[PDB]
From Swiss-Prot, chains A, B:
Residues 288-637 are annotated as: Seven-bladed beta propeller. Residues 1-272 are annotated as: Six-bladed beta propeller. Disulfide bonds: none annotated. This is Tricorn protease. Keywords: Cytoplasm, Hydrolase, Protease, Serine protease. It is found in: Cytoplasm. Tricorn degrades oligopeptides (probably derived from the proteasome) and channels the products to F1, F2 and F3 proteases, which then catalyze the terminal degradation step, yielding free amino acids. The keyword Isomerase does not apply. GO terms for biological process: proteolysis.
Amino acid sequence: MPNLLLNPDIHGDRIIFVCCDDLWEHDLKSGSTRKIVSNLGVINNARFFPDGRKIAIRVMRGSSLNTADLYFYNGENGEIKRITYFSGKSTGRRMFTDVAGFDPDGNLIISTDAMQPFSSMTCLYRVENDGINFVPLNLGPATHILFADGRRVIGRNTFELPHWKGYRGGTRGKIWIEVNSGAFKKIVDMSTHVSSPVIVGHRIYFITDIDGFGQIYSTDLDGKDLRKHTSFTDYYPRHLNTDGRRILFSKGGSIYIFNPDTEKIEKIEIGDLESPEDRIISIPSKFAEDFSPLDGDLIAFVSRGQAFIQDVSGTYVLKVPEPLRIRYVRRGGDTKVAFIHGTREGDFLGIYDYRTGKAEKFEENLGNVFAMGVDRNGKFAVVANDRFEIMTVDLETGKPTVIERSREAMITDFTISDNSRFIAYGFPLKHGETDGYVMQAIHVYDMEGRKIFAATTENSHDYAPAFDADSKNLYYLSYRSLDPSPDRVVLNFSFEVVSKPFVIPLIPGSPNPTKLVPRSMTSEAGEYDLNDMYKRSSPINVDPGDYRMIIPLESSILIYSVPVHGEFAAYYQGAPEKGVLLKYDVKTRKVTEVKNNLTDLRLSADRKTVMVRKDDGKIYTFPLEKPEDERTVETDKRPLVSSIHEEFLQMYDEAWKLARDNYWNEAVAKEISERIYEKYRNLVPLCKTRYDLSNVIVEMQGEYRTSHSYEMGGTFTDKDPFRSGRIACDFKLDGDHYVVAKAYAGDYSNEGEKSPIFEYGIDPTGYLIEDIDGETVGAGSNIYRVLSEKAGTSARIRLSGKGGDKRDLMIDILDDDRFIRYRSWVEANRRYVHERSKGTIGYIHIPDMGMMGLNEFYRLFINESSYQGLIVDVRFNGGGFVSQLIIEKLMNKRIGYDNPRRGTLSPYPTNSVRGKIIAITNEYAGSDGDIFSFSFKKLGLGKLIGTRTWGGVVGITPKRRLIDGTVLTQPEFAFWFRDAGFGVENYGVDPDVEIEYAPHDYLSGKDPQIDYAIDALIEELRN
Amino acid sequence: MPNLLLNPDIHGDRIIFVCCDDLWEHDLKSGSTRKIVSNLGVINNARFFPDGRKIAIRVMRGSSLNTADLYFYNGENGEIKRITYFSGKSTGRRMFTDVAGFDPDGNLIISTDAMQPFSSMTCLYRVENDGINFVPLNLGPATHILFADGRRVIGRNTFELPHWKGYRGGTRGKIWIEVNSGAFKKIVDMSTHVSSPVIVGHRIYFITDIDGFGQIYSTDLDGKDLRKHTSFTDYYPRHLNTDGRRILFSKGGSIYIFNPDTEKIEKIEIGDLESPEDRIISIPSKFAEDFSPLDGDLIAFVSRGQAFIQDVSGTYVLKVPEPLRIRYVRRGGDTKVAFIHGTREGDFLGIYDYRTGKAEKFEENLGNVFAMGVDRNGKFAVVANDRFEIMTVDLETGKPTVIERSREAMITDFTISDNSRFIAYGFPLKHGETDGYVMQAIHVYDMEGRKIFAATTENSHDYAPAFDADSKNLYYLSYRSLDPSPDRVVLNFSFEVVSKPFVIPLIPGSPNPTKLVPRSMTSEAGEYDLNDMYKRSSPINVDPGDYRMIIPLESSILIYSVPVHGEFAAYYQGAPEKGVLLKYDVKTRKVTEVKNNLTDLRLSADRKTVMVRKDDGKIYTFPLEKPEDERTVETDKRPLVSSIHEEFLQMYDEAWKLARDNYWNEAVAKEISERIYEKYRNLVPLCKTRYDLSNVIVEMQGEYRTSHSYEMGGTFTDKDPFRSGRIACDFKLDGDHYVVAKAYAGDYSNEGEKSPIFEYGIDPTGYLIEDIDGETVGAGSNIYRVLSEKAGTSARIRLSGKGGDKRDLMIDILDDDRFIRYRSWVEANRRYVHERSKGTIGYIHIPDMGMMGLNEFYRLFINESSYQGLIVDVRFNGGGFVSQLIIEKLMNKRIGYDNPRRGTLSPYPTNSVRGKIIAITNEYAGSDGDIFSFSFKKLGLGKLIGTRTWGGVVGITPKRRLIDGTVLTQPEFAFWFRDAGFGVENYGVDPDVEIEYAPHDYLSGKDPQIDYAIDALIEELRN
């Protein structure tokens, strides 16, 4: 059982590399190997210093390796020391904050965005005093910095891209070079991506897959004389590193060597190194899901692919006796529960009796199940697959019977009548193969006569169907109560609270039960008749809002309400939505609160037990009759047990299946999948850590050669994320004191947009930081570290300005100051554009096409839209989906005015740009950012200035995760531009005018992109 | 900066050893070193298998390394695997559950007490199927098992004893040997302790300090031909281990080699290996203490030697700017706090103003301070030292002035009048230099006239003095309200609730304020007169109970009550005592509850703020006027920061000082201390882990050559303790199924004394365990592991007995079953003694001389005391202090009877033993156990049978701990037996008849000690 070796570095006979997240050293001479450093978290890069004595190491921390920082290793005394306290943000695809290289003097040059507004601004910094001070090289963003003959060699976006093989977009790795002690020239700019550059002698060796596969090449210090050296076919080579003599690298999990002279490729022998305990223990709550209430006051829940029947206490627990991957568990009888078991083949229905033991599992495939339920009389079950089908499976025989198939989306919202006769469900529809919206009409299926009826019309969104106990009327919710709500910032209106409940008696002639129509004055007791029942529909007198569930009770109705709120947290942090359980008494027609702070709710089949999760993450349970009596559902009593190798295989196959099942093009999928499966499956057994699995999985995802194949979430370590103390400032070591080199601030009156020092009425810029919380900082005291240890609290900071000016304030040491830096940048550029255009041009910047973008666009769109000209800077735009909405705005043309008796003119439309517009874009703007760029030109809103953009317009919508919480993504929505097709994908967008931003432009402190834009508009504004 | 190397093992050129809790391997040949295993917790022993390929490792877990288990290491593939799930209990002095040796076949033999009733029964077991099955060798308790010429060599109690150099007690390490394929003979039994035995050729090499220091010796396989090989003088050698050729060992932190042939000693070169981050982060709550409320609703508290001023929230925190070791912090003004700083020299008073910054620290030494307080007007402070002095320190000048010095105990209970004029305190006294009890009388000191007065008489215990706001009357509590409470088991009575409050008006003529004597009917307003004030004393009408504090308020009085409760938990688990704050309204004379679940309480100087800790460990704070409004005091917001090397030095010096300051003999102390200081201080800088420090400290404690020098508590790891699933049963692998070899049970009707399976009315013995919680256990499934994973929960266990008998019950998987095994043993021996003496002899066993002992003694004393003869088995007795109480019982002689008209005779006394008594004792009974043994003979209660006992009769009473919570102990109370002196110490007690318990006696399954006892009594019972 060998390991998965990777990311090596060489120096003489010694060779360091990574295995099991730890760092190892190998001596070709003796042939021995040893672990030189461990227990620091997950390590992915280790670099030999010039002398070959010390080693710079990049280690990641946080459950999902969302944070990272650099460490030093002295192989002389075995000393270990943290160098940076930046807590750089990183993801699988962009593992920023690493070693850039070493300067001639033998000093370490790092690449980080810790002090930058945009993650992609991984600017270069020279490390001094072991992390005490940091001197910027002002060469702009870079991933590698080599030196040759006194010439700086810069590698841009030159990190590996395993997730996207054959990438040819604008963010492809490129190489520049110095020519005139300050002048730079781009020398390697192939059609494909260039990664991991090295210089042996006077040639730069790098990797690219221009020929269709990853190989090693080289060229003189002028990007000329290209040569193809290796000819691999098994796995792409990665992580090139050298010592000046030979080149080192990794492939398919082994460490190889390439001698530039001999041009010979040889594999290093290392054999087995480490085989940790395969049987691991996990905490059920960390991976729990699908919590459901059963009879006898029991509970059912799924975790890490396993299922359990336990009591609220968590003291008596039973595991369902079934192999890996239980997707769903559902009450199917007094002591019987029905489950959904998934395998590489698909999803299958199962049944288990936690009393006897009988667990006969079916074999009839159901495809990819996403919803499952069982009638109250354990006769059959209802299932929804990704084929958009809703079906009934005979819980006795196992024969699934398709009832109806939607052609727009899955039928996951359904309910069964208590008498097991009707099945009401939401049926997504469209009235055209290209409609912009998808309607949803409730459908009712009758088990007798086997026929479908329309409970609702197909003009809006009707959902949450639910029958009453006696099964006499069908209740449901709908967004039909249209009534606009005003926007407090932008002239606009939205449908905020347009949800309302309705009812439909299954017996014609019977009135709305909530209308309290005296029995003596009605003549019900007719007979079921579901024909044209959508005509008998009636609403229930309850104020419009945002309802997600309706539960009909004897003399009351429970409703789940979701108060209006922003979507920022939900969009970026996946933060759960907050609701509250409301009660409506039919008699009194009064509403009340039953339970708040709910983020999820489930209800028993008997309607007597309620199970819910609150905003605190915990799960509770209480009787509907006495909601005051809730208990906490504990599950962390019994350890969760599993096998790494069994889970890793399971996880690989699922990742491999989703990638295949969700790829936008089914054809390409059948081929790529079938051609990459085995190849990458053989590496799984070499994996010992979640990080090992990641390497295998990502490389296999790259085999689809498309954008948006990401891997997020998942548990990679038990190490806590790195902390970084921030006060929105820039420090500089000058003598024996740290000086406030810069004090970031954007809109003083906005929230969280300035150095917390400003609250004390003083701009820290220029002042000298004496000490923090008593401890003196400076020449012999790392301020970065001290601040790190105070992150998230308030500390006393003694400062000193001009003269005898001395301050001693309680400052809030923030955990992050990115946004403050972003806003600072935007406001700077905004001030710049005004002054240079003599107050005739506006400025607006769009960070992404998500909630934040929407925020930033409108934040300035309301003050900048009425200038002679407008600059819509969309550089570094991270994509999203709201581009269409922003374009729609800019699309407006001013065609009139309103003349008031008093006041100023009112432009019509209001959201109309006054004059000429111009867009700025770089290679760091992609996805929706790609779409926005192409559109801006295509619609002729103005000229596009900058550099070709990213080029990944195949959207995604993940709907399933791995048993460890990992959320993988698959390019499922290919964007097709009219008169261009899918051309944008794997290419990007070409600006009308290309304005490069060379390393020398950064050294001169000039932005050639924004300058051109401004100067260009002034020219157009001469008319 | 080198490391502290230790506990090595050798094999050829390779040499494994421990450094920084991790295991390392060194190759003499190449001279290189590497860490072969880490992150398992703290490792102290590593043993090479025969083939030299695999390695057995013993690792400890739990904050205080209170738990341990064994792991395997395959140097071929680098596989790691946990072998045992016993969760063996261990302490610094007795690190049980380790590798005993290897049998001829190359199998691992382990020594553990996991399945034994007494910790000292570290019986031998052969490991099979990598921990699947365990086969007992039935050779009795052993620490080492070697083999030579087909002869078993057993080493009893042969582990190292660094804490007690020159130990010559009965538990001293000894060596036995087989002579007749079943017959054993003791061969090495020197006067001193023999540790770490090895066999090179045909000689056993071990270590002993018979010459006054640790050295290596050897003798033929007959304990003959003694030879002294080494002649060290720097540090004792430890952990001998060999491969058959050369011997390996450690000394003063280095690894050495000894060649039996050459007889040459050589040091192995290893140099620096690991130097972790010196700056560590700790959690304040984990080491907090001395929490105190200040003004402005602020809080003060001490942790890990540091002090802080923070708000209840813990958001605004200030550290007191003072070097290590702040013992106490006390409010001394609006923004000023007084503190007690400790150094190697002693304790000193200090003052800090968290507003300005002025922190002038005094230099006048105060000795060892244990109580400190400041008047309400920040003029002076009151201090109590271990010299038994109470003094006033001028908070301005610094001049301490001794007021009074007790000669019995410290004066820690004192209070200052609000007007700063009187100082009331408890003054411990005796009316004889040999009295059995120490009385305590409240004393009052007047700052004006400077004279002491007697507030109370010296006939009992008067405490908790407290003045009223106006400083007109002095309140206090006393245990004078004598009134006996009946014992529900043993004919006895105790003073349970005899506490009551009293008051003393400082102005003669003034009545008891609580008596509500109409002002119009009294003529107070006299003048202070403290003369014969103890005559004016008066009680306050409040029911007797167990009060710890009394707080006089305007029209009410607060009293801290402690409901009667057992002391088991408090005695063994140090569990805090539970109290409740009560309120007494002077007017209504009615009592009420203010706050419960309190385990500690503090009160502001203004009597308006209350700070308390509840049984949940958290700290709260609430206004006395509105006790319903309490907030939680948080402190874990700001990380606690420190330096390992600065703390380690601090901790060493303190451990070194306490050891010196508390040794029973001052003379011996001055010499030993001064002679061992530097020698062990030079090792501190080599320490990197708490375990490294422990090694140094323990060795230095051993330099006192006395018993009771222990080291408990302290934080050694962040690893959670090992878990062990137990159901009071013994399993045996038979084929492919585990069989219940034994089902332990003691008194079926008592609590926690039988296998939880019994509750289902079935004796598991004989049955076959099929599966647990679904998972099948047996040949290919470690039941020990499975049970471990269900510890502390209830699991479904399928069993199978004779015929088609099959059970399926929900069993409680316990975390431990020691007590159930102990009770089983006692009951077995009890049943045995009855049957063999034909029902004429009783049996009683005393496990220790603590609360449990008291429990077990009376548990059987009431049914066994009236037989013709009695056996008081006190083997394995762990000591304590209640021996005197048990003797007093047995001391009773039956001299009469009560003849009833109906019923049976009543013996007088009731607690009188009917006839002849006989005691059984082994080397595993010590301390009070030692005292009991000597006494039993000395008083002639009967004969003593067994083997010489432990020999450590120098008691301890720790009263101070290290900044990391570590609790060190120092032999402070030397026991002097009349007509024998201190002879018992370092020797033990000699039984009238010596009955050894050889290994062959265990193999025959016979107890020669209990047999002799029974047979001997029958002989005496012939009269």
